[PDB]
């Protein structure tokens, strides 16, 4: 919600995109196609895995009984131990719920951001040969074939190669 | 005509919480709080001693239950609810401290104290410590007068820890069942027992007198203890009612102790234990038992805390 | 040409918050996070309340005159006063604070007879220290005496089995007479002893007769000792004098909180967080009023104020 | 100031905008107007309320006296209880001040972001019929009446229905 | 990482830019130049100093021994003290490492954002007289001299002055 | 063409983030103090290094502590060779007492104004050497008039008429034999009781055979209590009683530390531990988990770097 792409100006997601997180769907003269973007997907996944590795962490710290379940310790020190234990339980529960809320906020935004980074890179690619319609599409102002699409994807599309035509259509 | 970019989604996502919204659906999420218990002590690869009928303190003084435990080694020590410290009715003074030490002992190694005695009985026994006839605490000696009524001598036994490590030292005070029970055992007269080192000064008077019978004895034997430092020396001086240590105890290394109600399993592997088993998990927190001990996930109030592992989920 | 322009609101005076990156940055609206406001009363609405006043909490167990109206109470909330007092005849409870701590969360107390009866001794010993229309005594206890001055108290054994489903609170007393002959006059000559056992309890007691200053005009002392008796377990008392016997055992009723206060009760306001100087009513996560508050409280913090921004960064001209 | 709108390329805010957080102010042939955007306002407010609901929270956790104000507990355990309490006070104070700084940093940036989301949505709407002057305004390159403004607002402005006139500029 | 400028569409950084964090490097008719932007640099620096001032902080809180290194306290209370101290060490270590990871994530993204704020401000400046090539450059579509550069920098470049020329230069 | 861009350096430093380990940034700075100063930085603090004198010593007054019976301090340093005692014995409930004394701000002594009739006052021991047997400087060993004679049933009382709580000490003497006792204080069962409004306790001596420490088989054991403004201690007794001559009032505020290093009046710190001072502004520290004072929070980690520059990208 922070970068305004996912659930923003893109209307929704593609349940039929099984092979990645972010992708291209095109329409042109030859037909219609759907193929995912690897580098932006890998980028997000890599950050989420980075999180997990930090959190699915093992504390190497050993604690011992100060306590006795079978014969009860003298009551006074008993009650101090409990009050402390309960005190730590309050801290850790607060910590846990905070860390998780904050991480999630960040993960969600992380994802919004990558989408919006993909978009803006393509927009940059196409220079003056297309237009932002405003639902996460680029209306191309020149006939562009299925090898023209695959040149956009893997970032090779040479703009001035069709520049004159499209600028004329505009 | 047009190229469009976009992101994936799924028909059922899972709800997480954020800083800003409750129950926001994301594509994939994963649990952060361990709720699954293993109802067994996962002991694989650990030197284990399950004390069963023997109480931890028992391993020091040596009632019959503990004969097989006078000198153990352990990484992991398990107390049972039916463990028992004592044959002849009595208590350890300052017991929980002692238990805490023993639990992390890594086990115990006994050494003689090299006490020898002259002009007194050494071989006092009780039908309360049954071993084929009256016996007594295996590590102790009941010191008596030579004949009923005769006057116990003013004695001094001393012992110097000449090892590199602290020694655990134990003795006993006998509280007879009557004033004449006393005088019959150690002679007439006000009795006293003192025990000193460089960090220890304390004296003890027996309290002979009428008690109910436990295990058919009205007397009581109560155990007292101290850590003797490398090179320091205990002195005992006394004139009766004294249960003398025969051996001192040295701790071996390092161990953890736990109290449990479940079977041992040398086939699973964990470091986080509680009376009803092992918590096996990588997750940072756990909602199983707030008194788990070992190397554990941090205990929390919440039953579940989902961590988002995917993007905002947005269906058709 | 023409123009359209978007923009955001602002106000002439905003309020300063802190961020990760700047101190005192002005935003449009902000709200407080640390409670500073006290209510100088014990907000007791809808809780079963017992304000002990002159009666000390341990009082309720043994029963000096000041506690007569408290021998069997029920409570959700129990309030000790600074003028509470445990004791009529000069003496102390051994291990008192634990006992208090148990009593505070007792949910109140229910007494049951222990069904002791006695033969060939006095039972009705009294003192002008416990005034009740003449010398009286601790309402729950019995001063066991010899039959006549000087006579030899017998070697007695009273035992009691908790046959209820719940743990019993058991109390007794040791009498320390004002002289060795004060003793021998009461319980006969000879070294005295008292022992008390169960399955988790083994302990003996000798009286220490001898000269003390008078408190409430008595040089003697009676000291109380106590234990939790488990369902099915059995206390035995054996003794030959200087023994203040329990008549009733005490069973705890349920759950309660205990507090210590110096303020009036108010059955009209409602709170769960209490301290000697009143009630903290608030939803806010933290509080700077009293670090020793008890109950369900905001977390005590050092800071007097921590403002949370509830609007955007604010920009005038 | 993370998205560079509020206190960024927008110069400042409008004290005379009482009915919302984000809004449009226009100038055209018929006259000048000021009217707020509901959906982007509601959006921010909804997030700030979301925070509040999480933080104005009640801990259901009961604690009891381990302490005694009237007769003092034995001094040793006394000092242990105090050192622990003081230890928790350090933690909670650190926690409180952190949560608040961070929340605020996030609230502030949250707001910056929504502004910058409104802007870019309009910019998208207008396609090629206007220009970013760069102080949060769109210079329209065609005459556009007060029903043309209200068509931008509630997101209907059809671009190609004025494309030609404007483009020749 | 988050705004996609630094290590994003800008390819890398300039080791030969000693006098600031963000800056302009130009090429035109007269020659090539490198000069830093003060206001965006100052802005970042100011936020990082803001952090430091908050964190390099002194706790005014006094703690005392409850412990004794010369003669050991009775063991039971000994172990309670240790268990609590060990408990606090767990919290503080967790806190410390968290604060640091989070701060850094934020600092890094802070810097990305300021770059991307500079870029977009210039892009706005140049209106229709230039084009995003997409590596953090603006190809100018009109001859523009070294006083034209310094007019962009300190934010004065008047667009409609060279607009006519540049627009038909694009067509 | 004009182009914008950001700086970089050929070697940066690795930090951790929420999302990646060891990501290189341009500049970073340390957060965990690792540097110790092997001295007690005492500059501008009223300092009392107790050396041979044990903190509890200052209350009763063996020879080691003569120069410490009445000190003032902001900072109090116990040494490993400090020593509470001349005549063999112990303080009961010692650590509490230490804890009080450590924050006392020092101590001020006042007479208790006890005077005695028909008994000896001047009992001494070769265990407290001061050019001949002496005794604890603050105490009096109360004796019978002649060997064997019957010590009288006495009552000394004392009312704290100052604004502040008084620290009160007494002693019980445990003779080396039953006859050692009866020789000193007469035959018969002895008793000592001590009361106030928050204090009730009695003491019986335990005469009998012990090893000699410092050539004495007896033991003197010290007991203590805080007397509240306006309240009154009463001592009643018939022997085996070591009477206080002076009471102790606490002066103000101090910290106490235990140390094995020299004092240094030239450096300045508020965070101490037995092996010196931790001087630092950094939030956390990895030097000693038992530091006391105003300290950085102790952590497990040796280093935690905080990024002070941007993501660094070299050519
Ligand atoms: C009143 C009467 O006649 N009762 C008889 C009695 O003769 C006897 O019971 C004996 O009672 C004595 C003390 O009264 C002990 O309890 C005897 O038990 C033992 C024990 O096993 O512990 C024997 C043991 O060897 C003794 N060890 C010693 C003396 O060093 C101990 C020991 O003295 C006590 O435990 C110390 O308190 O006592 C017990 O047999 C029997 C027949 O002999 O029948 C009664 O009715
Ligand atoms: C020295 C002298 O002549 N003094 C007299 C004395 O006769 C008497 O004071 C009495 O002193 C005794 C102790 O010496 C008790 O303190 C008496 O008080 C009571 C009490 O109320 O507690 C009477 C009560 O009935 C007793 N109850 C018993 C024995 O069960 C108690 C009890 O003995 C003690 O509390 C035990 O410590 O004592 C008190 O009257 C008066 C007139 O008789 O005048 C003195 O000068
Ligand atoms: C067996 C034998 O005869 N040995 C003699 C012995 O008489 C004596 O040594 C003395 O032994 C006594 C105890 O038996 C004390 O230990 C003496 O030391 C002092 C001390 O300095 O503390 C003398 C001191 O003046 C006494 N002060 C009093 C009574 O107030 C104390 C005190 O009584 C005890 O410390 C209390 O327990 O004792 C010690 O000199 C000498 C002959 O003179 O030589 C032995 O061989
Ligand atoms: C335990 O040992 C004692 C003391 O050594 C034995 O006492 C006997 O002492 C007499 C002299 O009065 C000797 O003739 C004997 O040699 C000793 N007994 C024996 C069995 O040899 C005592 O009898 C022993 N008691 C037991 C049950 O073994
Ligand atoms: C404290 O620990 C547990 C509650 O978590 C309880 O079972 C135990 O009885 C308590 N101890 C005391 C003294 O209340
Ligand atoms: C869902 O999350 C878990 C935990 O990270 C992960 O292992 C798994 O790959 C995810 N599932 C899918 C289908 O991606
Ligand atoms: C240990 O202590 C003694 C004093 O009893 C000391 O003189 C000696 O140096 C030490 N001896 C050994 C063997 O460690
Ligand atoms: C200011 O903040 C408070 C707390 O959230 C809120 O209730 C109130 O609506 C706010 N005031 C205005 C005018 O928005
Ligand atoms: C108390 O009981 C005794 C013994 O049974 C009796 O003789 C006596 O009269 C009673 N004393 C009083 C004051 O009732
Ligand atoms: C305790 O044991 C007795 C056996 O005498 C039995 O009657 C009683 O029901 C038991 N009570 C409980 C609570 O188990
Ligand atoms: C502990 O702290 C309280 C205030 O928080 C204080 O009044 C009390 O006296 C302290 N207790 C001790 C033993 O210092
Ligand atoms: C507690 O920890 C310290 C060091 O952290 C250790 O030296 C000390 O002996 C421990 N105390 C007990 C009672 O185990
Ligand atoms: C690196 O960081 C520290 C702390 O912010 C700072 O004092 C110093 O100026 C920086 N060093 C360089 C070379 O920029
Ligand atoms: C101590 O006092 C007594 C009795 O008052 C006196 O007779 C004696 O000489 C004194 N002893 C010494 C050694 O001064
Ligand atoms: C306390 O009360 C006593 C009564 O004897 C009085 O003399 C004294 O002045 C009072 N002191 C204070 C500090 O109130």
């Amino acid at each position: 919600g922070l970068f305004g792409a996912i659930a923003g100006f893109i209307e929704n997601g593609w349940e039929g995109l099984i092979d990645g997180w972010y992708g291209f769907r095109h329409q042109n003269a030859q037909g219609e196609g759907t193929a995912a973007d690897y580098k932006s997907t890998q980028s997000a996944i890599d950050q989420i895995t980075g999180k997990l590795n930090r959190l699915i962490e093992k504390t190497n710290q050993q604690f011992e009984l100060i306590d006795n379940e079978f014969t009860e310790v003298e009551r006074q020190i008993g009650n101090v131990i409990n009050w402390t234990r309960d005190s730590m339980t309050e801290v850790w529960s607060y910590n846990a719920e905070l860390l998780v809320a904050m991480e999630n906020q960040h993960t969600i935004d992380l994802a919004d951001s990558e989408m919006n980074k993909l978009y803006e890179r393509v927009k940059r690619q196409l220079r003056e040969n297309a237009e932002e319609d405003g639902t996460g599409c680029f209306e191309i102002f020149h006939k562009c074939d299925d090898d023209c699409m695959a040149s956009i994807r893997n970032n090779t599309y040479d703009h001035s190669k069709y520049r004159e035509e499209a600028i004329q259509n505009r | 005509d047009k190229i469009c970019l976009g992101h994936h989604a799924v028909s059922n996502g899972t709800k997480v919480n954020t800083l800003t919204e409750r129950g926001v659906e994301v594509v994939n999420a994963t649990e952060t709080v361990e709720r699954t218990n293993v109802p067994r002590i996962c002991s694989k690869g650990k030197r284990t001693v399950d004390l069963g009928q023997c109480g931890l303190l028992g391993t020091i003084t040596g009632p019959p239950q503990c004969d097989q435990f006078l000198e153990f080694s352990a990484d992991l020590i398990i107390e049972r609810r039916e463990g028992s410290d004592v044959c002849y009715p009595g208590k350890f003074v300052n017991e929980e401290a002692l238990r805490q030490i023993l639990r992390e002992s890594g086990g115990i190694d006994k050494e003689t104290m090299g006490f020898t005695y002259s002009g007194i009985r050494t071989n006092g026994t009780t039908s309360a410590c049954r071993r084929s006839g009256s016996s007594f605490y295996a590590e102790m000696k009941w010191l008596l007068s030579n004949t009923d009524n005769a006057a116990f001598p003013q004695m001094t036994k001393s012992y110097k820890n000449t090892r590199k490590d602290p020694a655990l030292i134990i003795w006993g005070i006998h509280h007879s069942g009557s004033t004449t029970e006393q005088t019959k055992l150690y002679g007439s007269g006000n009795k006293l027992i003192t025990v000193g080192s460089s960090n220890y000064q304390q004296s003890f008077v027996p309290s002979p007198g009428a008690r109910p019978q436990v295990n058919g004895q009205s007397g009581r034997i109560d155990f007292h203890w101290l850590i003797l430092n490398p090179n320091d020396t205990v002195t005992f001086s006394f004139n009766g009612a004294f249960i003398a240590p025969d051996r001192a105890s040295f701790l071996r290394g390092k161990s953890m102790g736990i109290q449990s109600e479940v079977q041992v399993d040398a086939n699973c592997e964990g470091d986080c234990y509680h009376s009803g088993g092992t918590i096996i998990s990588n997750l940072p927190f756990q909602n199983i038992n707030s008194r788990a001990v070992g190397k554990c996930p941090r205990y929390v109030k919440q039953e579940s805390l989902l961590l988002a592992t995917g993007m905002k989920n947005v269906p058709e």
Side-chain angles (χ1 to χ4, degrees), chain A, chain B:
Chain A
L2 232 227
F3 290 77
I6 303 176
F9 68 91
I10 291 112
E11 215 140 335
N12 70 318
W14 302 333
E15 287 179 60
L17 178 52
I18 54 145
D19 245 316
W21 288 27
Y22 311 96
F24 303 100
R25 178 180 287 169
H26 70 37
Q27 187 160 343
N28 73 331
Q30 311 179 215
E32 202 193 319
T34 267
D37 185 38
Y38 169 91
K39 280 183 188 179
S40 66
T41 281
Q42 206 49 42
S43 179
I45 307 206
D46 268 6
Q47 288 174 92
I48 274 84
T49 292
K51 290 193 174 194
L52 262 22
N53 282 340
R54 204 183 26 97
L55 299 195
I56 277 35
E57 197 123 12
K58 297 181 91 72
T59 13
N60 214 69
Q61 207 168 341
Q62 218 198 56
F63 290 100
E64 324 271 310
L65 261 27
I66 30 45
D67 221 1
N68 199 310
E69 201 168 319
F70 293 165
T71 31
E72 228 196 310
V73 298
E74 284 281 278
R75 195 73 46 142
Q76 192 166 33
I77 187 85
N79 276 335
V80 177
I81 287 144
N82 278 16
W83 171 74
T84 307
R85 182 186 295 117
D86 289 350
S87 280
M88 303 300 319
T89 297
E90 248 232 284
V91 171
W92 283 108
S93 304
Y94 165 95
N95 281 1
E97 180 144 35
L98 184 48
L99 160 85
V100 161
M102 185 224 77
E103 293 292 349
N104 292 354
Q105 192 71 49
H106 181 260
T107 294
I108 286 168
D109 285 341
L110 204 22
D112 212 35
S113 160
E114 276 288 342
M115 176 80 285
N116 181 69
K117 270 167 81 187
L118 180 60
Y119 191 83
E120 303 227 62
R121 176 248 280 182
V122 151
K123 171 256 230 304
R124 256 185 220 91
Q125 253 174 249
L126 303 179
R127 303 275 313 244
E128 216 80 288
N129 317 6
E131 280 203 45
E132 282 187 65
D133 64 330
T135 59
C137 287
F138 298 95
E139 275 174 47
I140 335 168
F141 279 115
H142 70 75
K143 263 211 166 104
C144 153
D145 49 296
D146 271 17
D147 274 84
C148 162
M149 296 304 191
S151 76
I152 300 175
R153 271 186 282 271
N154 54 36
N155 189 8
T156 42
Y157 174 97
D158 185 38
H159 70 303
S160 35
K161 214 229 174 235
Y162 320 110
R163 185 167 151 114
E164 203 102 319
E165 187 178 341
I167 307 187
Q168 205 277 115
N169 295 106
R170 292 184 45 202
Chain B
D1 256 324
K2 50 212 269 280
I3 199 177
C4 309
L5 38 224
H7 57 62
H8 75 332
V10 284
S11 44
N12 164 52
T14 47
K15 302 208 230 255
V16 309
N17 306 328
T18 80
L19 251 21
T20 228
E21 181 131 88
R22 294 218 97 199
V24 16
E25 267 201 11
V26 292
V27 175
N28 196 27
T30 196
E31 187 56 72
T32 252
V33 177
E34 194 45 68
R35 281 182 308 287
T36 294
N37 190 53
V38 174
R40 282 169 330 251
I41 307 308
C42 294
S43 78
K44 169 214 134 169
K46 284 165 205 196
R47 215 171 280 289
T48 302
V49 173
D50 170 359
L51 303 161
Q53 301 265 32
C54 171
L56 187 49
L57 315 174
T59 68
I60 293 319
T61 48
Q65 322 77 263
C66 293
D67 278 338
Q68 257 55 78
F69 298 91
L70 305 182
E71 266 198 280
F72 66 92
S73 299
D75 296 332
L76 168 70
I77 290 156
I78 298 165
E79 295 175 66
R80 293 315 178 151
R81 152 166 268 128
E82 72 266 359
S84 168
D85 285 323
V86 141
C87 46
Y88 189 104
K91 65 186 185 277
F92 285 70
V93 170
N94 227 62
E95 55 185 288
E96 185 76 11
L98 195 61
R99 280 195 191 99
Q100 265 151 44
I101 295 175
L102 284 191
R103 286 207 199 94
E104 64 164 4
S105 72
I108 68 219
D109 171 26
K110 302 268 159 81
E111 203 175 286
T112 163
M113 295 192 54
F115 292 156
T116 41
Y117 302 92
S118 208
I120 54 145
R121 249 129 91 217
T122 260
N123 51 15
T125 75
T126 181
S127 53
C129 323
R130 244 75 168 287
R131 236 192 222 106
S132 286
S134 299
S135 202
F136 195 60
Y137 288 96
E139 305 293 8
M140 317 302 285
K141 324 229 79 140
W142 199 329
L143 305 182
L144 245 54
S145 254
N146 236 30
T147 337
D148 305 318
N149 266 23
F152 196 96
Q154 181 48 56
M155 254 191 214
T156 299
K157 286 335 163 162
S158 78
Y159 168 92
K160 187 186 174 164
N161 175 2
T162 68
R163 269 163 75 151
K164 268 62 214 177
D165 276 11
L168 173 63
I169 305 299
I170 271 229
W171 60 104
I173 312 291
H174 175 238
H175 305 281
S176 324
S178 60
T179 51
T180 91
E181 177 98 328
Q182 181 145 297
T183 91
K184 156 192 147 76
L185 293 202
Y186 320 110
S188 85
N190 286 108
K191 300 291 155 180
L192 180 73
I193 296 95
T194 120
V195 180
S197 57
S198 315
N199 306 111
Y200 195 92
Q201 174 191 307
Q202 208 153 331
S203 61
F204 311 85
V205 196
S207 298
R211 286 160 194 93
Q213 302 193 309
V214 188
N215 276 297
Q217 296 304 335
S218 301
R220 300 281 184 281
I221 297 178
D222 287 341
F223 286 110
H224 291 83
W225 64 263
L226 75 75
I227 304 312
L228 223 201
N229 271 342
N231 207 16
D232 195 1
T233 316
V234 247
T235 321
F236 303 101
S237 17
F238 59 85
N239 49 312
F242 186 77
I243 308 307
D246 205 63
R247 272 142 113 226
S249 303
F250 297 78
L251 329 176
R252 279 179 194 283
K254 233 238 158 259
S255 62
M256 216 210 325
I258 69 171
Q259 309 167 306
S260 166
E261 312 219 281
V262 296
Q263 328 223 339
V264 170
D265 184 17
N267 161 276
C268 53
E269 166 189 48
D271 294 332
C272 182
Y273 290 120
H274 67 89
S275 63
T278 309
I279 293 162
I280 300 171
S281 188
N282 293 321
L283 301 184
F285 329 107
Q286 63 98 350
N287 182 233
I288 290 154
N289 185 296
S290 77
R291 289 176 71 256
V293 285
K295 285 140 173 224
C296 292
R298 263 79 84 246
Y299 173 81
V300 294
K301 261 142 57 98
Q302 301 91 326
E303 284 180 349
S304 179
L305 287 177
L306 301 151
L307 188 70
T309 44
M311 55 176 72
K312 235 269 94 162
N313 179 67
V314 215
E316 291 184 42

